[PDB]
Amino acid sequence: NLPTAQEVQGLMARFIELVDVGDIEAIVQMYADDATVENPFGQPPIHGREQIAAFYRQGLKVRACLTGPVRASHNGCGAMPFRVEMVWNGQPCALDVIDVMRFDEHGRIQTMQAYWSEVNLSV
Amino acid sequence: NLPTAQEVQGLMARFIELVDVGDIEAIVQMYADDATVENPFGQPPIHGREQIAAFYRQGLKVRACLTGPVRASHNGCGAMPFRVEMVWNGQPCALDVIDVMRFDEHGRIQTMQAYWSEVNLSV
């Protein structure tokens, strides 16, 4: 059913772990089949598991970690701060992001909005 | 005009400083006259400076501090992680929150959503 605040904290924490290890198939399965992703917030959203999978395969030697607790509400939504470290054309980079997610009645990610821009990038 | 990503970072950081010192009038002036506030996200929103001022006067010996960088987008929005420490009936408490704000063309807060619940409270 619609995840409780405690369940949202668990789901979002699991999401980061999956991103960290890079299990693309497991990441995609956490999304609803018709989920929408806005990354970064402000740019046109991608829709559906096919587009989401393509996005992650292209994006993910990457490391991800929570940098603070998951903030969860009682209506199936949560927000979390985390950092992503990768390599861009050789040089190591870090990106600080905040994701806001809305889950559906099946415990799957319905909508995801990623807040970040160049000001949160470090090379 | 619509604040740039760098400007959003500055405005949101200033907001926390105002909350920390507790300057109610200065806090209210950062909001648009008809701004809406959802605190915590999930509960009915309050509307207008009068209601917002009443909310802050009731809410603010409180300390507030950013616990990570402000994540800003290019369309006048930002998200930030912070902690609020206060006293509840004698016992000291801490609350971890994430605010998402949308600014208008005048650089004022149009909409604010605060993500938190009992799971983010520490007594």
Ligand SMILES: C[C@]12CCc3c(ccc4cc(O)ccc34)[C@@H]1CCC2=O
């Ligand atoms: C999509 C994402 C936010 C942005 C992002 C991720 C991973 C690799 C990236 C590589 C980039 O060059 C730019 C942005 C990202 C995260 C994976 C989990 C998440 O929330």
Ligand SMILES: C[C@]12CCc3c(ccc4cc(O)ccc34)[C@@H]1CCC2=O
């Ligand atoms: C409104 C707020 C989030 C919640 C909150 C604040 C201040 C005092 C509080 C006292 C409470 O007993 C419960 C919640 C708050 C913050 C002031 C700045 C902000 O974003």
